[PDB]
A paper describes a structure:
The Delta and Kappa variants of SARS-CoV-2 co-emerged in India in late 2020, with the Delta variant underlying the resurgence of COVID-19, even in countries with high vaccination rates. Herein, we report cryo-electron microscopy (cryo-EM) structures of Delta and Kappa variant S protein trimers – both in the unbound state and in complex with the ACE2 receptor – to gain insight into how their mutations underlie changes in ACE2 binding and antibody neutralisation escape. Finally, the P681R mutation (present in all B.1.617 lineages) immediately precedes the furin cleavage consensus sequence (682-RRSR/SVA-688), with initial reports suggesting that the P681R mutation enhances cleavage, and consequently S protein post-fusion transition.
The Delta variant contains a novel T478K mutation within the RBD - that is not present in previous variants of concern - with uncharacterised effect. While the Kappa variant contains only a single mutation (E154K) in N3, the Delta variant contains a mutation in N1 (T19R) and multiple mutations in N3 (Δ156/157, R158G). Consistent with published structures of other SARS-CoV-2 VoC S proteins, our structure of the Delta S protein revealed no large changes in global 3D structure.
Author numbering:
A (entry chain B): 795 to 827
B (entry chain C): 856 to 893
C (entry chain B): 548 to 620, 641 to 675, 691 to 695
D (entry chain A): 531 to 596
E (entry chain C): 745 to 794
F (entry chain C), G (entry chain B): 943 to 1041
H (entry chain B): 14 to 69, 77 to 145, 158 to 176, 185 to 247, 257 to 329
Write the structure that this text describes.
Amino acid sequence: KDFGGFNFSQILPDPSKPSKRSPIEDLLFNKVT
Amino acid sequence: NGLTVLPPLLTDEMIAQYTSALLAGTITSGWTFGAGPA
Amino acid sequence: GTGVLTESNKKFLPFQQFGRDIADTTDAVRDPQTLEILDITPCSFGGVSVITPGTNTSNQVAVLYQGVNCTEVNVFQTRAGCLIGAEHVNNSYECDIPIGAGICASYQSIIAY
Amino acid sequence: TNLVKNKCVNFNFNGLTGTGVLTESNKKFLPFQQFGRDIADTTDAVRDPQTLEILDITPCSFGGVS
Amino acid sequence: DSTECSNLLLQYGSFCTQLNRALTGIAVEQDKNTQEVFAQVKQIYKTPPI
Amino acid sequence: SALGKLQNVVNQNAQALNTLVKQLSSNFGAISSVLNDILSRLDPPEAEVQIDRLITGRLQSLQTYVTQQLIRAAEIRASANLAATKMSECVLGQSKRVD
Amino acid sequence: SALGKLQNVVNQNAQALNTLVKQLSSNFGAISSVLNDILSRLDPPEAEVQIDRLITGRLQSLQTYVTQQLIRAAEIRASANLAATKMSECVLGQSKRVD
Amino acid sequence: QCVNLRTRTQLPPAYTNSFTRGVYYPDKVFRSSVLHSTQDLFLPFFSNVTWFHAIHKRFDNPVLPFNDGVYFASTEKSNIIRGWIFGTTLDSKTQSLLIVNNATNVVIKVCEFQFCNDPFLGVYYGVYSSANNCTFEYVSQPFLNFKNLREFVFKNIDGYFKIYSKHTPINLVRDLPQGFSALEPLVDLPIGINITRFQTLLALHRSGWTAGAAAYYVGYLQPRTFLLKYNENGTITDAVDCALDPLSETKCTLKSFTVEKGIYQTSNFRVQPTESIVRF
Ligand SMILES: *[C@@H]1O[C@H](CO)[C@@H](O[C@@H]2O[C@H](CO)[C@@H](O)[C@H](O)[C@H]2NC(C)=O)[C@H](O)[C@H]1NC(C)=O
Ligand SMILES: *[C@@H]1O[C@H](CO)[C@@H](O[C@@H]2O[C@H](CO)[C@@H](O)[C@H](O)[C@H]2NC(C)=O)[C@H](O)[C@H]1NC(C)=O
Ligand SMILES: *[C@@H]1O[C@H](CO)[C@@H](O)[C@H](O)[C@H]1NC(C)=O
Ligand SMILES: *[C@@H]1O[C@H](CO)[C@@H](O)[C@H](O)[C@H]1NC(C)=O
Ligand SMILES: *[C@@H]1O[C@H](CO)[C@@H](O)[C@H](O)[C@H]1NC(C)=O
Ligand SMILES: *[C@@H]1O[C@H](CO)[C@@H](O)[C@H](O)[C@H]1NC(C)=O
Ligand SMILES: *[C@@H]1O[C@H](CO)[C@@H](O)[C@H](O)[C@H]1NC(C)=O
């Protein structure tokens, strides 16, 4: 992830999560009930 | 007869004030006020 | 029927007893004993609305009677209706709870502005 | 008659009739209560009058055939 | 104002609540429409006197 | 006829309200359109039938009015979304979009 | 209240389904809201009338639900068309359109 | 046998606050973690309930109108209150209901009794004189510093007499404690009779006579709406009176105990007619 200092970890999919969602997407799915 | 008319939240004076603000912004500042500081 | 009777400025022809509006409701009537014309305004109908902040914040409420004059119900007369329980202030803030006709309510007691 | 569980049967419990699958329930009723309702006011839990046990009433498996 | 009519009307359920809810939604939607169209600036700009 | 678009909205709303109140004067097959006349002229066993006819007619009229208001509200919402887009793109900036 | 727009859609759909369920508990002028009670308490000549009242009430409820679902579907379709436009013009390119 | 009690001390009746008491289960239906809005004869929250004392010389056994229902609260020790008198005229002309709890069991009878003017029992350390035509008898298991709190709700609906009750262990000296306790349904009686008046039955202590220390409260049931909260275990833990204040009216309208910030249209306002005018 060498993008010249630009960080996209909060929007790219998280490999640690089984749902393969981004942290922002995971938060969005948790916040809607 | 059960019929009521609710007034609008923004009166005609405040809508006129909003249009005046938009006119003043587009006259004195161009399109700069719509994208950030005027 | 049921309605408020007021003195009327309308001039009925001598064969006429009552009067209808656009919606065919009786808005004027002639008294059969004393020949005078009376408007029949309907009794006041309002929508009762409760203005409150979150129950986590406070339990204070204000009551809005929509389209209702304050003489027929911290009492403030707005164009939207009569607002009871909100202190009217002369200061202007951003709209927090919309009341209508330029009036908004907030919690700081409940104020209306 | 005898009680049959885990099948879509027509149940008539104390004048309350319907069709459903009667399974064992983990809901512990208070002793004065007889029927059980969900949010939508449908009978989903019931008490057998002969033996004081709680039964869940699952609706029969209706579906759309496409 | 007929109480017998309202007693008979309660047998039909929540039709009246649905209609009031729809009209309330339209009423708040109109204010949202005006807010979206005209309130596009949070600063009240003024022209110069000259 | 310059401002016909606003006048049509005002006229449609007033006409819909006027028709909704006019529907109260219809008996919908009952003996009378007035509840007071039915309450004063009949016993409750037949009065329930007469008010039932008036209730179903008036409820149908109100449902029709609310449905028309919802459709008109959707049209006005589309027009308002277009107007907000024009306010953003024509007033607050210069638009390259043709027409 | 950040995600209120999605929550409103979820709440409206759930509330419409709940209202459609709760309309079954209304008798609509019949002696009971349960068809079994009417069929067990009355002979078929009068049970036909009571069942007819329940049928017309439930049919009106279902038509009301379908009509409001169609109106909400039109609103959601407009929002989805806007979202597809934003996907094409903001994500797949750089937009000169103001706001 | 009847005995006139002529040693009473004159005192006006007391009044106190109901707080959030008098709630009972409207039906026999279990509900779990849900909010239910119901229209029934309920006791209003924070209402003015009549307070009667039994202390030594006070012996409060009057006859009161039943109205549409009776909430009976009892701050009781040593079991002075034993039963109730239900009827319309309280004589042999009509048919009356008797509820008694003596030393062994509870007896419920619907008969034509000749009530005394001052009915009571007595314990050493006379409530009727005749019984002519009986139609219903029911013998049951016994229901029972102030140590016990007894809540009862009596209702006459469609010829059914509903008795709701709750036992509460309290340690408060004088007034009603502040809290929430929903009353379970205890017994439904198929009586089918008219009842418009009631009277409490006390017990004397003899060693003249002495009145044991007891206090009771009478509240009246009114047709209203409650929003009841049912927890996971299915007990009513909290309630909202929809006609008490606009905040609880909003809670009743939105079907929630928590209300977010905003304006919520809850009811409608109608001016009520003051007079009726005829012009002929
Ligand atoms: C990109 O951003 C993420 C999160 O904003 C960075 O991950 C953090 O790394 C530091 C030190 O490496 C840790 O102390 C934090 O706990 C991490 N946060 C999370 C949420 O994991 C990451 O280092 C940044 N850079 C790259 C190249 O990925
Ligand atoms: C206890 O007092 C009451 C009230 O005075 C007595 O009831 C009255 O009895 C007399 C008997 O001749 C009647 O004439 C009155 O009509 C009764 N009053 C009412 C209101 O009915 C009662 O008799 C007394 N008890 C005893 C045992 O003497
Ligand atoms: C209860 O009623 C009595 C008189 O009936 C009155 O004096 C008292 O103030 C009332 N209490 C309340 C709390 O209203
Ligand atoms: C209680 O009353 C019942 C019926 O009235 C009677 O059979 C029983 O003997 C009584 N017991 C005592 C202790 O008085
Ligand atoms: C009620 O009792 C009286 C006196 O005991 C008697 O004369 C009368 O016949 C009785 N009525 C009935 C219906 O039993
Ligand atoms: C019940 O009793 C009261 C008072 O005695 C009376 O006014 C009422 O009409 C009675 N009701 C019936 C149904 O007899
Ligand atoms: C519900 O019951 C369980 C045991 O049955 C208990 O652990 C839990 O605390 C109860 N919940 C409440 C709110 O009392």
